[PDB]
């Protein structure tokens, strides 16, 4: 009877039960291929295989493999029968209609859920923070968005999408690590660099001063030892890597950085709501985890915004999972129970019901 919440990320699936403080299942969004099984899903592939990611930049693009991920989610991870549980799924901001329709059809016709709902990821993180109005910077493995939201509605004309996120930052770290003469080439080595990123990287409050500091001394150098004993030592790469979020030209992307796109997004909204966006800047997703990133955004947004604006960055320690937590809260609400698309409603209206019920 308990509702299920599933946040399908480009990199990680977060799944569990509404009411819980956290997703009980977190596993890679991959299908791997080598009377053995023909494919290995999630942690199966993790534990000889070529990996495919069914979700790209937050959008489902391999439906056959996505079906495998959901099967793995229900039956192997959560160990539930989906026919017995209302299921809340997440989607990226600006997810195309055809996609949301197909998610809906597969849930009702393939998994036979009794009810379902699709929510925008960024809206859920805002809800997790106890707000229905605000602007969210949601940055994960595959995509980054600025999403201004009023009374629970993402305001689509003002949404900014940026195809720079966690995976690109890992790849960039690998690239600049070659300057010190290191070489990381395999899937397992990319994972090692992902870990270096998650452990040693940070966002400098003043990038140019930090570069000067790093040039002067060894004060910022850190070592990282692989389990095999090989050591890699890292200096200014620590902060140059996530600097890319603020200066996308670092990877050759001629696009505004995340501070500028926050400003642009707000400036596209109704004059009256702007003050409320500035005062309610919520960060969510794994790529917002860098030490210093909240401080840096506070400074940059403050530099762009009028003096009249109180600027507040909300960055809870659990923010890697804010989307899921917001889903867990939403699906457990009394007021939300009339919002589910029911099987009966799908039967009568077809997959396009998702446009009328999920917003």
């Amino acid at each position: 009877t308990t509702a299920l919440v599933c946040d399908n990320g480009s990199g990680l699936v977060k799944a569990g039960f509404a009411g819980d403080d956290a997703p009980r299942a977190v596993f890679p969004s991959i299908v791997g291929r080598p009377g053995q099984k023909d494919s290995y899903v999630g942690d199966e592939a993790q534990s000889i295989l070529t990996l495919k990611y069914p979700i790209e930049h937050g959008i489902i693009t391999n439906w056959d493999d996505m079906e495998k991920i959901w099967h793995h989610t229900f039956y192997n991870e959560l160990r539930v029968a989906p026919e017995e549980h209302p299921t809340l799924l997440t989607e990226a901001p600006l997810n195309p209609k055809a996609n949301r329709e197909k998610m809906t059809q597969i849930m009702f016709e393939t998994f036979n859920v009794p009810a379902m709902y699709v929510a925008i990821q960024a809206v859920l993180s805002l809800y997790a923070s106890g707000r229905t109005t605000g602007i969210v910077l949601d940055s994960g493995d595959g995509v980054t968005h600025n999403v201004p939201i009023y009374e629970g509605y993402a305001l689509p004309h003002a949404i900014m999408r940026l195809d720079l996120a966690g995976r690109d930052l890992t790849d960039y770290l690998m690239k600049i690590l070659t300057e010190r003469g290191y070489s990381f080439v395999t899937t397992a080595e990319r994972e090692i660099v992902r870990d270096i990123k998650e452990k040693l990287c940070y966002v400098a409050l003043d990038f140019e001063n930090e570069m000067a500091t790093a040039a002067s001394s060894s004060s910022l150098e850190k070592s990282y030892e692989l389990p095999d004993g090989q050591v890699i030592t890292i200096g200014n790469e620590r902060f140059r890597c996530p600097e890319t979020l603020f200066q996308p030209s670092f990877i050759g992307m001629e696009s505004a950085g995340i501070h500028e796109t926050t400003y642009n997004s707000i400036m596209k909204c109704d004059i009256d709501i702007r003050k409320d966006l500035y005062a309610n800047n919520v960060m969510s997703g794994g790529t917002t985890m860098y030490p210093g990133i909240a401080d840096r955004m506070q400074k940059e947004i403050t530099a762009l915004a009028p003096s009249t604006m109180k600027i507040k960055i909300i960055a809870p320690p659990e923010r890697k999972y804010s989307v899921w937590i917001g889903g867990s809260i939403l699906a457990s609400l009394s007021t939300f129970q009339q919002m589910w698309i029911t099987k009966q409603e799908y039967d009568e209206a077809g997959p396009s019901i998702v446009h009328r019920k999920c917003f």
Binding site: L94, Y127, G130, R131, T132, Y150, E151, G152, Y153, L155, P156, H157, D270, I273, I329, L330, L333, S334, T335, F336, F359
Partner: peptide, 26 residues
Amino acid sequence: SAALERKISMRQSREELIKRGVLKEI
């Protein structure tokens, strides 16, 4: 999450917000 539930249940309708020019969909 009482404060949240309150805010959600009294949200203005999509049609009204589109009519107010707040909500501009793609």
